[PDB]
Amino acid sequence: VPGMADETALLDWLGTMREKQPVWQDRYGVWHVFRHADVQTVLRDTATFSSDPTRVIEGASPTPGAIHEIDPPEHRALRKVVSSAFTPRTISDLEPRIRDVTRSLLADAGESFDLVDVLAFPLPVTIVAELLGLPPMDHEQFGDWSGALVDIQMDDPTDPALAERIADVLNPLTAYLKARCAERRADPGDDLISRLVLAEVDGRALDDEEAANFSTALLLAGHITTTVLLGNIVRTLDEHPAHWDAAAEDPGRIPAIVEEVLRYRPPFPQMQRTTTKATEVAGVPIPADVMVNTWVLSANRDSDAHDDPDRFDPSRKSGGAAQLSFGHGVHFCLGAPLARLENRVALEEIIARFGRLTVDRDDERLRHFEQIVLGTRHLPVLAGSSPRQSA
Ligand SMILES: CC[C@H]1OC(=O)[C@H](C)[C@@H](O[C@H]2C[C@@](C)(OC)[C@@H](O)[C@H](C)O2)[C@H](C)[C@@H](O[C@@H]2O[C@H](C)C[C@H](N(C)C)[C@H]2O)[C@](C)(O)C[C@@H](C)C(=O)[C@H](C)[C@@H](O)[C@H]1C
Ligand code: HEM
């Protein structure tokens, strides 16, 4: 399998798999699914395709409060704890603050800067920290913890030792959040941690383990992908720069750009399930108790789903609930309205200040993530025209 960092090679490979081997078993006994229709089938059928990886990891037991790894009927009660925090009306109230953070961060940039260090990292981490009621002094901790997680040594995703390694890398974060949970129990505010520690799920409060693990999932979910998307947006516009001008003339076009970048370059290009029973996808027999890898990236480029799938085209009618890059079915991204707002406001503010940004391809800081996510660790950019220029 080509690594994430060589996008062209990876896309080439996925394309031949869609044609020649749409359901593929790898050397670890992991089963890969490449076509859009088949990815939807898998994601919709939660009884057959569990979100709990521990089923196939010997020695590992389910992680209490890990919403992303919990199946119906328990899933719905846990999601109901936080879903009201994430409604479009409630999220829309965050626009002024998102814009204030973005504008201030960009105002001090200069005309040559790393988009990630300046804005794509600090914006989403501030917004999710503020959602969870955590302090600014803790942002650097979160970036260190997400970075280590993203670069964890990893090959066979069913290895018991990988599960232990993840646990160890996230131990400091979960411990920190456990302390913050105990703190909010005593002195609640109206942040997300307060809501989760005071909630009653199926007749009782979440225990300390559950609440910390749920907090951990919310924190990680809330920044890594948003950071990656913003980078992917600027990098994709740089490859199709006629769109900078069009968005400057009509900023109403920015949400369509955001949707099309999501399709074209999903931050999270693959997700795993486990089979609860013997099943078949596209007539290919898959046994019980194995791990399944759904390639969102391959689904998004499938010509049966999207005409001329390798063309970047904001005029595509796709988006909303049909945005596969936010998942599909019961686990569909709780943060979607928020991700969409942060990225809309970021691009508006970039265009307002600079008109356009050019990616500096000769700057050595430009490096792709090698695994797990689809994007760049840093994106050195050059300003088109900035308020700093003078006679
Ligand atoms: C809450 C929803 C979000 O969920 C999370 O953020 C979870 C808390 C992470 O779970 C962690 C921690 C733990 C203890 O869970 C209880 C563990 O049992 C699982 C397996 O790993 C998440 C799944 C991570 O992904 C996984 O990493 C692993 C290191 C490798 C996995 N694969 C490639 C094999 C990969 O699939 C990661 C990095 O955070 C993905 C991020 C960046 C992402 O793009 C998606 C969109 C993410 O935001 C949502 C999915
Ligand atoms: C552009 C950025 C984002 C992308 C691409 C993205 C993507 C995804 C995807 C693909 C899933 C489903 C994973 C699966 O089915 O296993 C998911 C779930 C989730 N996301 Fe997002 N996300 C983004 C931003 C956010 C933000 C800002 C938040 C706010 C905290 C958030 C919170 C969550 C939560 C809590 C879940 C779990 C939902 C559940 O399991 O019921 N995400 N996300």
Rounded to whole angstroms, the Cα distance separating 265 from 296 reads 10
Give the domain range for residue 302.
1-391
Residue ID of nearest Cα to ligand 1 atom 44: 268
Using a 6 Å cutoff on CB, does residue 40 contact ligand 2? no
Tokens of 213: 């693990």
Instruction: Indicate whether residue 123 lines ligand 2 (CB < 6 A).
Output: no
Domain count, the chain: 1
Q: Please give the number of the atom of ligand 1 that sits closest to the Cα of 221.
A: 48
- Calculate how far, in angstroms, residue 255's C-alpha sits from the geometric centre of ligand 2: 18
Mutation test of ligand 2: which of 326, 330, 342 has the most ligand atoms closer than 8 Å to its C-beta? 326
Output the six-digit token pair for 265.
Answer: 């370059």
CATH number, position 131: 1.10.630.10
| Mutational pocket test of ligand 1: of 125, 149, 225, 262, the residue with most ligand atoms within 8 Å of the beta carbon | 149
**Candidate from 191, 232, 333 with most ligand 2 atoms within 8 A of CB, to mutate:** 333
